[model samples]
Target: MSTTIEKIQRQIAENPILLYMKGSPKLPSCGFSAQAVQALAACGERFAYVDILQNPDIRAELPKYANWPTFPQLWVDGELVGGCDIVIEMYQRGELQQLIKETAAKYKSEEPDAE
Candidate 1:
């Protein structure tokens, strides 16, 4: 059986751009999460998300796993990219967009050619 930690590991590993937030991008539960979603949305790329509110185990365990005591955690290419404040700062500086686009491009190139 997969433990919660293992599940978290798998989630982080599988999604190149992942947001562990309080709610979905369309309906964020907290202001921080909402802001984080906006920053990611501004990058204009699809991202995977886990609603920690829906997953109590993750909500209780992730802070310890990530050592980040905050919601709206963004992970890119299997690395924790910090929370809302950092995301907003990165977005404002144009770094977030560039990083997101670069990751998207890399993934796009790895996929089979589409007609």
Candidate 2:
């Protein structure tokens, strides 16, 4: 008995690393998505991804939900990390890998923080 918004919340909370990208990690539909997936995967940690191309409702609503107006959105620790540009920038500066490692470790070591 959960609404779409509620389901989105649950998904985000349960997955320590979530990527609301354009396609699956294996086959990305867009360049931005491809780039983000590469950056995230480079962190050497497993992450969950939602193919927005298939999930139309989520694709429509997530921008409003996350207050981010773009696709290939990355979420970590139940937080919206940002879209492709931000992720790539972070990766280029070595910040993305560090953050992913720390965030993944944190999720494993403790319960999720308040969403």
Candidate 3:
């Protein structure tokens, strides 16, 4: 089986939106995590979340991965977008909704990154 950190990174690469949260979206452990989930749902975005409390390595590695020393980290399209505060800020400004509404035509081309 893949290690916890590996699984999370893999999921981030595969999913359009991913959250390294304090708890599952349906059952957030922290008030901040629940807020994060609410922000995403507010944008009508479907996301995958990994509760750091569920995995030791995931708990440790995520902070380093995002260069953020906090729970409720958010990733978008394989990129580190921000943490809870940023997400909430963006959501409040309606910017996050604009981002989520970005033309998600599954047919969009996935061009190869330049070497």
Candidate 4:
């Protein structure tokens, strides 16, 4: 098992969306993860995903190790966004869409320097 510091290091440096899911987005192992993925897709949000099932280290090192204690965790800009419950709550109020838009825009590169 890796230290929490190592996990946090990879979380931020390696990904933007950093979704710790039970399975791939195409095949979510948990109902909540599936719903969360659907919500993100509804807003056309582009992000990265990690299948906790495939990597034992990450799976074990995630919550208990990271103190997240939640599956299907959503991390944006290297910051934790809790689990599916929060996602569902955000979705209902349409705040999720706005949040995604702002988040996407934050890292959105400007229209290329030139051709």
Candidate 5:
């Protein structure tokens, strides 16, 4: 396996809620990515993101691996959740918030209390 695919695999496995988008959540490069960020923000969970524009290797190979030719791809628990439309729809239906909260809580509980 190529290093690019290995990197992508590791990233997906490591982040429970991951967004492979055009840019950072605060500065989305495309309308679709911006909207996706908004939906995730509303969920109120800290998530990981990759700026495809900056990582050209990921930009070129992700679609082939994901089998979804689009930006702002959402992945939950290492599963592809779809793009802008699907994310927005899930957010509207309250599914996104529920899923994110549950996923976050699982990871949070595994961490030792610091304070």
Candidate 6:
């Protein structure tokens, strides 16, 4: 059975862009999450999100796992991109858009090789 940290690793490894937030991107339960969704949406690429409200285990374990003491954390290319303030700062500087676009393309879907 996979452990919690393992699951978190898999999620990050699989999704080029992932957001761990208080709720779904469309139905964000908090102002920070809502702002994060908006910033990521402006990046104009499909991304995955984990709603901490629903997954209480993740909500509790993630901060400790990532050593980030906050909700609305962004992970890109298997890295912790940070929370709302960082994302907004990057977005304002046009860095977020470029980062997402490039990373999304780098991890674009690919067909598996025949066994």
By TM-score, who's the top model here? 5
Model 1, 26-70: lDDT tens digits are 775454767778887776477777787556677777756886754
By lDDT, is 1 or 6 better?
6
Each candidate's lDDT (Cα)?
0.70, 0.71, 0.64, 0.61, 0.70, 0.71
Tell me the spans in candidate 5 whose CA falls farther than 4 Å from its real position.
24-26, 29-31, 110-115
Assess the local accuracy of residue 31 in candidate 6 as a C-alpha lDDT between 0 and 100: 44
Of 2 and 6, which scores higher on TM-score? 6
**Candidate 6 residue lDDT tens string, 8-113:** 8887878888887777556764647677677777764777877775577877776667767556778877778776777777777677767777777777753111
Task: Report the poorest 10 consecutive residues by lDDT, candidate 3.
Answer: 106-115
**Model 3 residue pairs with clashes:** none
Which residue segments of model 1 deviate by more than 4 Å?
24-26, 29-31, 109-115
Error of 5 at 17 (Å): 1.4
* Ranking 4 against 5 by TM-score, winner: 5
Which one wins on lDDT? 2
- How much is the lDDT of residue 46 in candidate 1? 73
Q: On residues 1-115, what C-alpha lDDT tens digit does candidate 5 reach at each position?
A: 8778787888787887787777755676454767877887676477777777556677777757887654667877667776677788888877876777776666665421111
Question: Per-prediction count of colliding residue pairs?
Answer: 0, 0, 0, 0, 0, 0
Error of 2 at 17 (Å): 0.9
The residue-by-residue lDDT of candidate 3 on 1-115, one tens digit each, is 4455566677777766567777745676454767767877776356667677555667777667668765667776656767678788877877665555452223134321110
Better of 1 and 4 by TM-score: 1
* TM-scores, all models, native as reference: 0.80, 0.79, 0.72, 0.70, 0.81, 0.80
lDDT of 4 by residue, 42-87 (tens): 6536667667755566666566644565567766666666557766
Candidate 5 C-alpha error for residue 31, in Å? 4.6
Q: RMSD for all candidates, in order, please.
A: 4.5, 5.0, 6.4, 5.1, 4.4, 6.1
- Cα lDDT of model 2 by residue, 1-115, tens digit: 3357678888888887778777755676454777778877776377777777556787777667887654778888778877688777877777766767777778775422221
